[PDB]
Every structure is written in C-alpha cells, then in structure tokens.
Amino acid sequence: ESYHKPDQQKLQALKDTANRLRISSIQATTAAGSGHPTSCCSAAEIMAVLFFHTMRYKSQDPRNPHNDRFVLSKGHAAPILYAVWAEAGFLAEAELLNLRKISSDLDGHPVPKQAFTDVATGSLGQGLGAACGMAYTGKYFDKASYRVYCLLGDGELSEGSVWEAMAFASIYKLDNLVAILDINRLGQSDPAPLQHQMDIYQKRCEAFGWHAIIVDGHSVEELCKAFGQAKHQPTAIIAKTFKGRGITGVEDKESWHGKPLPKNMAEQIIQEIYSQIQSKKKILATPPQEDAPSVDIANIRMPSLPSYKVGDKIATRKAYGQALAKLGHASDRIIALDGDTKNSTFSEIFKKEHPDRFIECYIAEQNMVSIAVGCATRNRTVPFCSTFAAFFTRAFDQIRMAAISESNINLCGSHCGVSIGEDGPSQMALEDLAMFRSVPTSTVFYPSDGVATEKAVELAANTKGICFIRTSRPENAIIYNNNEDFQVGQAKVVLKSKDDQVTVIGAGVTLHEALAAAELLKKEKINIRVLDPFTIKPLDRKLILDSARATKGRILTVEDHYYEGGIGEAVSSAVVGEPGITVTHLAVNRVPRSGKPAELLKMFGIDRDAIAQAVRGLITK
Amino acid sequence: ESYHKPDQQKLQALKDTANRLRISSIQATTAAGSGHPTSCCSAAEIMAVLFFHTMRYKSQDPRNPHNDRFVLSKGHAAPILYAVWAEAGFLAEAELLNLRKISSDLDGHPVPKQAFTDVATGSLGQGLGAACGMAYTGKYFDKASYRVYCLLGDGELSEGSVWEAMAFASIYKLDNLVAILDINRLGQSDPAPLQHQMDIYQKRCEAFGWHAIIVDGHSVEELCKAFGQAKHQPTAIIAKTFKGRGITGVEDKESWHGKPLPKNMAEQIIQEIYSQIQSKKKILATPPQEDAPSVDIANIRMPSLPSYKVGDKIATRKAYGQALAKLGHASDRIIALDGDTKNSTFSEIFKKEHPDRFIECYIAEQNMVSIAVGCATRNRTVPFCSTFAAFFTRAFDQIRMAAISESNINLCGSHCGVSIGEDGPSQMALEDLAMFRSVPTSTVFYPSDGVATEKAVELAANTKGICFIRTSRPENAIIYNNNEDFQVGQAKVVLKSKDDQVTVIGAGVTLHEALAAAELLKKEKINIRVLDPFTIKPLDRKLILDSARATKGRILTVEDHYYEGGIGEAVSSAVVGEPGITVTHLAVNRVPRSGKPAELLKMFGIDRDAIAQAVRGLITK
Numbered sequence A, B: 001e002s003y004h005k006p007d008q009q010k011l012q013a014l015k016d017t018a019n020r021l022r023i024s025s026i027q028a029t030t031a032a033g034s035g036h037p038t039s040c041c042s043a044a045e046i047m048a049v050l051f052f053h054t055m056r057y058k059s060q061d062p063r064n065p066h067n068d069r070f071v072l073s074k075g076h077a078a079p080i081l082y083a084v085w086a087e088a089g090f091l092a093e094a095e096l097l098n099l100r101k102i103s104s105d106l107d108g109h110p111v112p113k114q115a116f117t118d119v120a121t122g123s124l125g126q127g128l129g130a131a132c133g134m135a136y137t138g139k140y141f142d143k144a145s146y147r148v149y150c151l152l153g154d155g156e157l158s159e160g161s162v163w164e165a166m167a168f169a170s171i172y173k174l175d176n177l178v179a180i181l182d183i184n185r186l187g188q189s190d191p192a193p194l195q196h197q198m199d200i201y202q203k204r205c206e207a208f209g210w211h212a213i214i215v216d217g218h219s220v221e222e223l224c225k226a227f228g229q230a231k232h233q234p235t236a237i238i239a240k241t242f243k244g245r246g247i248t249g250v251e252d253k254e255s256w257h258g259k260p261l262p263k264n265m266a267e268q269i270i271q272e273i274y275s276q277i278q279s280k281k282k283i284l285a286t287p288p289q290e291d292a293p294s295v296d297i298a299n300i301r302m303p304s305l306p307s308y309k310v311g312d313k314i315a316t317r318k319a320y321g322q323a324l325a326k327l328g329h330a331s332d333r334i335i336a337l338d339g340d341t342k343n344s345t346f347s348e349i350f351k352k353e354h355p356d357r358f359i360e361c362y363i364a365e366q367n368m369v370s371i372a373v374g375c376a377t378r379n380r381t382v383p384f385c386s387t388f389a390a391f392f393t394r395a396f397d398q399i400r401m402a403a404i405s406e407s408n409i410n411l412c413g414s415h416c417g418v419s420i421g422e423d424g425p426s427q428m429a430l431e432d433l434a435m436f437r438s439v440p441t442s443t444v445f446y447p448s449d450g451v452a453t454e455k456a457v458e459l460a461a462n463t464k465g466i467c468f469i470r471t472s473r474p475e476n477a478i479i480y481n482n483n484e485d486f487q488v489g490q491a492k493v494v495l496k497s498k499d500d501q502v503t504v505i506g507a508g509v510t511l512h513e514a515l516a517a518a519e520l521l522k523k524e525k526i527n528i529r530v531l532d533p534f535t536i537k538p539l540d541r542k543l544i545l546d547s548a549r550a551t552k553g554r555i556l557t558v559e560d561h562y563y564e565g566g567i568g569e570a571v572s573s574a575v576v577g578e579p580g581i582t583v584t585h586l587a588v589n590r591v592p593r594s595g596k597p598a599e600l601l602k603m604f605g606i607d608r609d610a611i612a613q614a615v616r617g618l619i620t621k
C-alpha cells in the first residue's frame, strides 16, 4: 500500500490531535494528583501520527490479531495512551478523568486488563524486547502484514535490556519493527547522559544494525514521512523532543518529572494549548489487512505416554528436552527459546526436530524472557524458554513484569542446586524456588525423574500463568511407572510402611537421597515415609498432613536450595499450628564451592547420611 | 613511565609463557574431567602479555591496594588465571592439577577465597561493571596510579549489563580502564552473533565512547603495543582470536566449549605445544607505584542520636536520605549510588551534602550493583546504593553474585508494597523480602519509623555481607524515643498489656496499621500485643515466642508483601512445631492495581480492619 502523503489539512488535524492529547494528559494527572504529564507532552506528536496516520488497527477491537501492535515502553506516559484510545473512539472521554482511581482501570501504568494493552511496561527498558517477540511472531510464525511500533524514553535507553533487544532485532531481521526514541533530553532526576547529542544516538543505533533516522519529534510532517517508508532493517526513529513540550515555562526544564500541574496552573496552560487547536473534528483510525492465521486454543496433549523404564537412569534436564521435542510433534503452537545453553538444558533436542520453532536468544536472559512474553501475547504461541535456573535470576524483573502482564510463559531452569558439582556456585540455582514462588501467578514444578518431567512439561503447556520447571544436572533413576497420573498440586508417596517414624519430603536429587536414606535406616529397623511434592507451588497440603499424621506428626524436608523461600519454608507455612505437627529442615546454609556432586551433597548436609541422622534425632527427641 | 618496547627475546618469552599457560589449562581440566580449555587457549597471549609485560602488581601480595586490577569477566577461563598466578610465583604449580577438587580452592570459576580474586564472575557479563567500580575508585577516590584490566568473551557481549558498563565508563571518563574482548568467534552452543566481523565490534565500542583498537589476539607484539599506550578514554582492545588456539584439530571448531580433552588427546596435544617452547625460563612480574592512600577500618558512628520527635510524621524513605547524609559527615568512606531515582529515594540529600561521594548510575540497576561491588573491593569504600525495591529485582543476579563475591554492600530499596498507591504494581516491591532473604549473606532491615531507619543505616554500615534496608513511601508517625537502642536480630514490643489475646507482628506501614487495629479492638475490650521485627533476617525468634506464650500461643503476621518468602513465612519457619504456637498470615495475594494507599491496604487485606477481623477470628477459634 502506498504512502498517503498528507495535505496541510491533515497535518493540521494531526497537530490538533497532539494538542488534544496534551490537554487530556494534563487534565487527567491534575485530577488524579499524580502522574507524568511532562513525559506525555514530549510524545504527543509521535502518538498522534502513529495512531491517526501510520498504524492500521481496529479501533473497536484493540486485541484483534490483524492489528498493528503498539508498545508504550515508557509506561509512565500511560495518560497519553489512554487519551489516544479515547480519541480513536474505544474509551469514553469522561473516563480519562478517573486516571489512577480504585474505581477505574486507567491505572498509573498500562496493564492488560485494558484491551489496548498487551504487556505491562512500568519497569523501564522491557517494552522493546516484548515488541521484538511480537515482530518475530508476525514475520516468522503468523507470517502476517502487521507492524510493531515501540515508544521508548531516552533515560530508558540506559537499560542494558534495551540493547539486547536492539541486537536481537538486527540478528533476526525484524524489518516489521520500528522503535521510536523520545529524546527529550531529561530523565527523572537529571538530564539523560547524552542529552540532545542526536548524532551519538544515531551512531549507537546504526552500530547495532538499525536504520536510524533523526527527526524533529514535534514535526507531524517529518514523523509522517519517516514512519511512511518501510525498510529492510529494524528502524529507529530518533526524535528530538522537549520534555513538557507545549507547557509554557515547564518545557525543557528540570524538576518536573512525575509532577502534576496544580489546578490553577493546569487551567491556564490548557487554555493556552486549546487556543492552538484549529478544529474539533477528529481523525478516524484506519483498519488492517486481515491476514493473520487462525490459532487453535485446544489442550495440547503428548502423542503417547512416557516410554521410560523403571530403574533406567536419566537426568531430568535431558528428559525435559526429550519431552519438549515430543510435545512439539503434537502442536505447532509450541516454541522453544534458549540463551546459548541448548546443549546444557537439552533444548537442542527440540531445535533438531523443530528448527523453525526454536529461537536462539544468545547470552541475554532478560531479553529472552521478554521475547517469550511478546510471543505469547494474543495467544499466538505457547513459549518454553530455558537456561540454567541460576541465570533466570538475571531476568527476575522481566518475570515479575510477566506476571503483571498476565502472561502465559513456561520457563525451564536446569542445573539446580549443588548437585551440578564442579562448576561451583555461580552456576548453582539455590534461590530459584524462592524467586519463582514469589511470582504471584506461578506454578512451580520440581520433577524428580524422567516420567515426572515429561508430565510436568505437558501440564505446564496447558496451565495459565508463569510456569517454572526445575531440572537437575545429574542422572537419577526412573521410579515412576509410565502410566502414573500426575496433576498440579498432587504429591506422591513413593515409600511407605505401617510403621513409618518420619515423613521425609524431598525433590529431585534429594528425593533420591531420601530413598537411599530409607535403605540405610532399614538396617536399623527404622522405616520412613518418603513424599515427592511434584509441585512446590501449589503444595499438596492434604497429603503432607495425612502423611505426617501417620508418622507421629513428624516431617523432615530436605532440599538442594537455600533455607529461605524453598520447600522447607513452603511446608512450614502450610502446616504451622497443626497439633502434634512438627517440621525439621535440611537445606544449603551458605554459598557453596566446587567438588563432585556427591561430595557437595555431603558437605552441605542434604545427602542420605544427613537425612538418616536427622531422622534418628527426631525419633530420639 | 615509558613503554618498554620488547625485544625479540622478550617476545619469544611471552610466547613461551602463553604456551605454558595453554599446557596448564589442558592438564588441569583433563585432570579434573571438566572445565573449559578451549576458552583458556583463545586468551593465552592476552594473559601472558598482561601479567608479564603490561600490568604492575606485587606477585606475592595479590590484594595489595597499589596493584593494577585484573578482572576475568569470562570466569570459565579460571584455569588460565590460576596458571598465571603459578607462573608469577604465588601459587604452587602442583596445585594447578587439583582444579575443581573439594580439597582445593582452585574452584571451577574464580572466587574471593583466592587472594588473586576480588569478585566472583561465573555469571557472564558482570565483570566489566565491577571493573568500572574499581576504576572509578582508582581515579576519583583513591586518586592512585593503578589501572584496571577486564577480559570478556564475545558471546558474553550479548549481555546488556556489559553495555551499561560500557556507557558508564565513557560518562565517567575512566581512562584508567581497559577492556579486552576475546573475539574467538564462538559461544557455548553456536557462533557468537557477530563472529569475526571485527569492524562491527569496533563501531559498537566507538559508538559507546571507547577508544577501540583491533588486534591479532595471538600476536604478543601487537598486544604489548596496544596495551602500552594510555588514552584519555576507556580503551577496548578488540582481539581477533581462535577458540582452542594451539590445539590442533580443535582450534576454531564447534562442539568443544566446556569439554575437556581426553587423557590420550591431552598427552599428544601437550607434546605438540611443548615443542614450540624455546626456553623454560620464566618472566618476573613488575611491582606498582605505591600511591594508594590509607583507608581506616574503624566502626562508623553517627555523629549524634536521631533528632526525630515522637508523634511527628516522616516517611522512612526520607529518613533514609537524612540518615545517609548524616553518616557521610562522620566518615569519608561512605559513598552513595542511585539509578536516576534520587528524588524518590531521597539519596539526593546525600548528593547535596557530599557530591564528590555520590555516583549517579542512571537507569541501569544491574550496573549500579556491580559498581558498588567494585567500589567495596579491598575495603576501599562503604557503598550504599538505592532505587525502588521493585527495581532491585532487575539486579538479582548481580546481588546473588555479590554474595558469592563475599561483598560488603548496602542496598536501600524504597517504595515497598501497595502503600505507594497510584503508580500501580510495576513500582510496588512485593517480592523483595523473598529475594533478599534468599541471599545467604544478607541482613534484612525493615525500619518502621524514622528513628529505626537512622539506626538501621548505622548498623548496616558496620555489618558485613549484603545489607538490605526496606523503606516506604508514605509518612508514618515516629513511635520510638531517639535514645531507643537497636540491634541486628532484636525485635521490639511496641504495645503490650497483661491481657493480650494475640501477638501481631507488623512492619513498616503494617506496624502502624496494627497499632490502629489495637485502638479499634480496645473498643471491644480486646487487647493485642504488637511486635516490630526491625530485622526480618535474622528474626528475633526468642522475643516472638516469648510474646506468643503471653498471648495464648497465637501469632498473626501482617505484611505489605506477597505470601511467599516474606515475614509470615520467616516467622512460620522459625516457630513451626512449638507446642500451643499457631501462626496466621495476612499478606498480598495477587498482583495489585492503582488507588490511594489506604484503599489498597484495604483491598489487599492488610489494613487495620483486616487485622482486627483476623484477631477476632482467632479468639473465636
């Protein structure tokens, strides 16, 4: 479709639109008594041109799969996003004045309870990565005509996650992606480092493989023209703007970030702005080409039961890769992402079988999570991203924001605990249960053998929210029949007798250490009940207490994790006050060190001998 | 001091050194059965030239404050670091063969139990930020002649944290810093994105303000020359290398990252390499100019007691800034860092009073933490870094690695919980207690008024490990006398009577809600004991149980945090099994939303009315 070169009337209408957007941003934030009108005002021409000249979308159906995508990475400009959607006719204009109220959904930063919002972006520097996932999906998966536009602040460009996204987009040739940089000179508490050194922004963007265009960000004509030419690269529109543009005496000034105008001032400024508006008549949105495919929404089922033999040995990290590849044969919706760790996590098995649905994200965990979030938007794909669980700590803010975004992504973190052995603590995940349990939409799977791992992958695929699967480096025996039924929130008793003296709860390597401890103790005529949680969150509280009532009220938890936030604390929190119920914990008490897996389990007090000694001390207490 | 231009004999000795380093890296990793010899071999000439021509250091005193610093950012090249320190005469050569053993300190990645290691770097992309802190300290604080050298991998350069550090170094004119990029074409599981496109690396470095020099990374002469010229910019030595250099048939090949040579192969390769060595005679290290100043090690004490009046109102975020500024008058060792949030966290007060000791880190939380770690190395400074607690999640891997680095840094995170109100959940820290409690060297302060905040700052300054202070946005009454004694691990009973029916544990805003609940309940002739933990980690278990025994065994915890990993779980874990002891929790059950602070405390069930209802239900249970 050809560029429609605007006439003066259309340009004036875009100017009028921009000024209406300024007025609304001021009105809403003054009414609220909080917000960021000066951050809205620098972006007003950009927003007017994108929404009312460049982009193609259904104004009454913002989530429509054919629409261009817009990502407001500088999320504190939310009032101007709300204003554009009122201008487009989707929101009632009166509702804008209810910004930030508990009675409204026009919250302080954008969130997906709003139909026009796909991802939450209030933590700066994350929007471009989500936009990259949307664009990758558009070009390679949907193979559709929609474009993706992402508006960033200049201070925001200090976040390294932005530059990971920059690099991703040029690696993957995202010529359907446009980044708009609101170079308004100022951050929150000082000028942004580069201020109005436009040439340095351009050099940085070009060095990272983008086509970079410097524009006057307050010229609707320059913006129309720059937006109106597609490229064969991701394109950066580097817009020179003034913070607080159009607010006399505030434009280009410090001390105004995140400060609303007092009511007397708002009135005077609004009259000034209003005097610039030539017509009240609004521009209409233009709809998209409807070429996005149908996506099925059905449950995804493994093509057959697991085919692992009891007593065979496999690491759960390898079972993960096998299971993911298997599920990829059952649904084309499954995609896999990994951060240069595919030979360690075994996501390489998926890549071998389904290369078109594997996304190499390189050593860039923050961006990987954001790509996954973007790919999951509008239910276009079912992403599984993997790395070492330790390195998911690099992406905690992206994971946190993924829950605020109501995202359905699946994360598999390998190499948990000290049982990795010789690499040492940098590679050892000892805080990942704490981290993922604190994510409010999470389900935490901790499979203890290959069968449980395959079942966890299948369950995760069909579970909403942030699903985490904790996998382990060493090989462990298969203990479950292939036809064992597994469910979220259902634990398994893997050893029991009628005279059990303690219920021992372990998972992964510590489940297997608990089973070996049981063999040790049998020597001593002491029996223990052994329970495998399967999911750490939610925890099968009923089976845990039923078990504990069978074993004199005594529970012992043993985990390859630090004491805080893990299995022991989950169990304690679930059962505290239950009469005759006691909980004793074994976990890792400090930063570990290198050695063989068995040696470290011993050093840190979570192997078979430690468990046996804790059981004896309970019995003799 | 002039460059000493090496003769052919010196160049040959550097070549011989490089080849000795290759042999040792192979021997050690073959002996261990794990490790990364091909990642060592690409760096062997770089390491030989740095250690035996360019840098100045005391070989027998690696921690000496006058020494040049070396940071191995690509930490999996640890065997070659160990080999250089054996070559320099500090380590016994036999010990190299004990790599990765539980009987050795030559662990899989470098760690500060090694005298020659300042920061742990096994999580890629963090070393350059630590190096920036070291260089900033050298140039601006110590005002000393030492230089800082940081070796990075090429895959590693995909981490956004690297680019934050790149930008920091050019902002702050770190002309005493050199980054060496080991452009060996390959990452772990595939070629690095840019492969041997040296010109693109150069353009990226130059765009970020560095002086960039492309060299043959296997030419000792080119390396000597490039290292031998100081600049007025941070300098990037962009070294074209081959992975596995010198290992015939492995050099430049895929499928060899992190794979040791089998013993038969090692023998053949080592003989080949050894045949290239012209002399066994080793080069000696050259010592530094001794111009680093003396740093005192004494306790740091506030110059006076707090001067806050009971019943006055102040937010703990503002008390933090006031307290930090005050302590800065007592010791020149205190430095402050903030990520473009100084007007929100009130670290601006410190900046006003002590501008030379404030480091603006911009919107780059990962790098901020790494700068702090680097500044704290060798005890040169006592850093306090601040941002919103929510945004510390962006830096969790840096914090995790800071504990592995045995670092003494202080972190103050503001804007905790839903009590911030209108910005919404992107800004609300609801997982920070979970996160910081999981850091094994942490102390977690949660001050409930301005007096407690000042005492927490003072205590943190004098406490080893990762200290976290959780501050709050809204103003709250001062409840403590200025002369109240505070200690790590000591809680306070702030309300008690002889007929108390429940012990209510709150902190920050929920302490004040618990006190208002107590006033509500008094109406009903119900008294409650109210306990302020002060530190969440370590928790005053004794006072909590003594309190609970006075209140019919009943504890109620109330927190502006998610359920997992916070105060309620800490308390439960501490007291589970204690007879007649029950714990009931109130916390935030899901992602919040915008509204007034009081409205959100109500919506999420953690305000005075929620507490009063939970107390009544205990009593009537």
Ligand SMILES: Cc1ncc(C[n+]2c([C@](O)(CO)[C@@H](O)[C@H](O)COP(=O)(O)O)sc(CCOP(=O)(O)OP(=O)(O)O)c2C)c(N)n1
Residues within 6 Å of the ligand: A038, A039, A042, A074, A075, A076, A122, A123, A124, A125, A152, A153, A154, A155, A156, A157, A182, A184, A186, A187, A188, A192, A243, A257, A258, B339, B340, B341, B343, B344, B363, B391, B394, B423, B427, B473
């Ligand atoms: C990852 C990260 N780090 C820091 C910040 C903080 N911050 C912003 C806000 O969080 C808004 O999103 C902040 O203004 C709060 O509302 C302040 O709360 P108070 O309680 O103090 O009122 S916005 C921002 C600066 C961004 O500058 P630019 O990128 O240049 O954008 P522009 O406004 O100039 O267009 C900072 C530092 C966040 N949010 N995320």
Ligand SMILES: Cc1ncc(C[n+]2c([C@](O)(CO)[C@@H](O)[C@H](O)COP(=O)(O)O)sc(CCOP(=O)(O)OP(=O)(O)O)c2C)c(N)n1
Residues within 6 Å of the ligand: A339, A340, A341, A343, A344, A363, A391, A394, A423, A427, A473, B038, B039, B042, B074, B075, B076, B122, B123, B124, B125, B152, B153, B154, B155, B156, B157, B182, B184, B186, B187, B188, B192, B243, B257, B258
């Ligand atoms: C933040 C982050 N993300 C990923 C990685 C993984 N990784 C490395 C190692 O972690 C070593 O530090 C990895 O090799 C493990 O030892 C493998 O464990 P196994 O159990 O599978 O044996 S190293 C690395 C690739 C780095 O490439 P370059 O930067 O190019 O360096 P070079 O080797 O070519 O010189 C990756 C992805 C870590 N560690 N950190």
Ligand SMILES: [Mg+2]
Residues within 6 Å of the ligand: A153, A154, A155, A182, A183, A184, A185, A186, A187, A192
């Ligand atoms: Mg700005």
Ligand SMILES: [Mg+2]
Residues within 6 Å of the ligand: B153, B154, B155, B182, B183, B184, B185, B186, B187, B192
């Ligand atoms: Mg490499």
Ligand code: NA
Residues within 6 Å of the ligand: A408, A409, A410, A459, A460, A461, A462, A463, A464, A465, A467
């Ligand atoms: Na899922």
Ligand code: NA
Residues within 6 Å of the ligand: B408, B409, B410, B459, B460, B461, B462, B463, B464, B465, B467
């Ligand atoms: Na401290």
